[PDB]
Design a protein around this ligand. Structure first.
Ligand code: 1BY
Ligand code: 1BY
Ligand code: MG
Ligand code: MG
Ligand code: MG
Ligand code: MG
Ligand code: MG
Ligand code: MG
Lengths: 361, 367
């Protein structure tokens, strides 16, 4: 049912974008060919839990003041459009992050930039095009909406918020004291920034805002129910669900089959600042830490293998399971807080939690 | 003075953006320092010609054709407009600084404004540079929300602005897909450099230049000056857009030649264009009037890293007398421009004047 309309609205959005480029931007059928494949490829093949959340949250707040059925159709189309704004935003960040991250695969398919006819110079701009599309579809559908001003101001703040996250992520293997663009870039070996604290900060901004906070806020917005909700609890949940999601990402990076996964994991190889990495270095012995230091951040045979055994060596899977129960409990008390006043809303956040909490296939 | 105030608005913008990172985003002094250095480097260095135009359009519209509704000529609305005009000006420069960061990387340039491209700096990584670029465009949205928060024009401001940000990205699409044949444009397929340069035609030059240069360089400054002036509807947009497309094309044409002919030293960078086999005005004008033989040679050189093969390509330009083609091109433009400006005077003379000043800073170009 939801996938039904959503995908309808996709076709709607896409028709509008491609057709506008033809009339007003003097584009040839070819470049319009390119751009529709770019869009489909970069914006499709996911489980769309971010756009979808918007629709559910919207529907669940649809009765906050016998009826019509027209309001219903209006709010739920608005919710599909914001939903796709979120998915195009992500698509933008993903295309730019595979380029930044030198990844090779995404979702079973090669990254956009690693497409036979995609050059990275064009890929880079293709990412910008996706972002531009979110503003284009926003003005096209919500020009006459009283909420437009506040929709885009919040949307743009999470855009920004996500870019800051990305600067956090990408400046984490280095000594922040030595973060001066005039000198060279020697990746740390003390791993003194492989901290849980520092971990938490990159993941909150890079992940939690656009993945958990934005779908909910947009959902509220197109439902004219935003102030109906304790933003404090709401923000708490999102920040938390979002930390947990990434940690889930972190572990799946390391121990989930790349076939299963859809991309041979690199984190260890690219020496990222994952949950495993910072959780390991904190509980780890002197010997274990010398050993980690000697087989981290290198594309090897026995090495990554080394770094993978060390993590089981340290029972990171038990630390994890303890994490999840901790998180699962704070999420439960937060949701009941919301339920008091916003029952319908705490219902959709429950539904959100349920697509997070498991997170398996 | 106009750069006095412009520049103290920069300091203003940078303090809010930077203070807001540390305050609302948990940023540490280390990364605030980086981000301040990044902003200065990518944003300060040029001549703020699109930035200061907005200031010019705005002063010349509180004077001639201004708001009658606006108090009996008393100084308070002017420093407010002007201050707005400065934010708008830095919005345009931050938007440009965004596209130049990504562009130097895309185009793989080595230097800009007499210096290593951002992505070319020592403690700047290519993956960080890309994201830095993105922050640049975000900052445009954060400075506008912060200063124009209560401003009635903020939506109109923001709509037009993103429209132009978008027409520029499309322009970048047109420029980078220039080298190969549109027909064989299929991401699922490897691709070869066009060897026949068959899309190196004027019509496509015109296109991948009008969208990529003239809108944000000429239309946006003028449009934003109108808006913070609240004098938007007082002008013929169509004729206004006409000359900004006019002016933009010439600017770009005039920049294509500086590229291949102005010394790297004097051009504040090293001309990639021939090396990178770009679709300059120069190439499209050569291929269109050249013999079969002159053309065979262009192919046997163009788009080759070199001192001597990049110099043969630069020879047939002289031999093909591109140098007089330009002169003639420039003259047809200066007169076509000249005309539209007069049509603008008939209702919007204050406006029409600021456009002469902008035109006069284009024509009179040796930078
Ligand atoms: O780079 P990672 O590891 O954080 C992740 C991409 N997630 C992103 C990427 C860009 C902006 C925000 N979140 P992915 O490439 O594993 O999907
Ligand atoms: O790459 P070019 O030659 O078009 C030029 C940069 N101009 C741009 C760059 C990005 C977007 C629009 N216009 P520059 O590299 O000479 O500064
Ligand atoms: Mg990644
Ligand atoms: Mg990344
Ligand atoms: Mg990951
Ligand atoms: Mg360039
Ligand atoms: Mg370029
Ligand atoms: Mg150039």
């Amino acid at each position: 049912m939801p996938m039904q309309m959503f995908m309808q609205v996709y076709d709607e959005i896409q028709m509008f974008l491609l057709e506008e480029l033809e009339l007003k931007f003097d584009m040839d059928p070819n470049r319009v060919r390119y751009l529709r494949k770019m869009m489909d490829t970069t914006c499709l093949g996911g489980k769309y839990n971010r756009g979808l959340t918007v629709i559910d949250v919207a529907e669940s707040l649809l009765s906050l003041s016998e009826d019509d059925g027209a309001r219903r159709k209006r709010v739920l189309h608005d919710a599909c459009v914001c939903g796709w704004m979120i998915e195009f935003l992500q698509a933008h960040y993903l295309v730019e992050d595979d380029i930044m991250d030198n990844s090779v695969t995404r979702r079973g398919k090669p990254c956009w930039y690693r497409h036979p006819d995609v050059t990275v110079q064009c890929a880079i701009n293709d990412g910008l095009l996706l972002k531009s599309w979110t503003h284009m579809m926003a003005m096209h559908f919500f020009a006459d909406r009283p909420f437009l001003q506040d929709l885009l101001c919040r949307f743009n703040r999470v855009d920004y918020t996500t870019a800051v996250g990305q600067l956090y992520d990408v400046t984490s293997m280095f000594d922040s004291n030595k973060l001066d663009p005039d000198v060279s870039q020697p990746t740390t070996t003390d791993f003194a920034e492989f901290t849980l604290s520092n971990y938490k900060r990159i993941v909150k901004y890079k992940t939690a805002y656009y993945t958990y906070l934005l779908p909910l806020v947009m959902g509220l917005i197109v439902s004219e129910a935003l102030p109906t909700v304790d933003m404090g609890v709401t923000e708490e949940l999102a920040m938390l669900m979002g930390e947990y999601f990434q940690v889930q990402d972190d572990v799946m990076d390391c121990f989930t089959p790349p076939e299963r996964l859809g991309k041979v994991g690199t984190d260890i190889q690219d020496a990222k600042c994952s949950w495993l990495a910072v959780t390991f270095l904190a509980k780890a012995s002197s010997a274990q830490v010398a050993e980690f230091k000697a087989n981290y951040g290198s594309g090897d045979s026995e090495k990554v293998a080394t770094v993978r055994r060390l993590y089981e060596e340290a029972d990171l899977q038990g630390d994890y399971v303890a994490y999840e129960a901790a998180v699962a409990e704070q999420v439960k008390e937060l949701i009941e807080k919301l339920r008091l006043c916003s029952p319908g809303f705490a219902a959709s956040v429950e539904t959100l939690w349920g697509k997070t909490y498991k997170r398996q296939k």
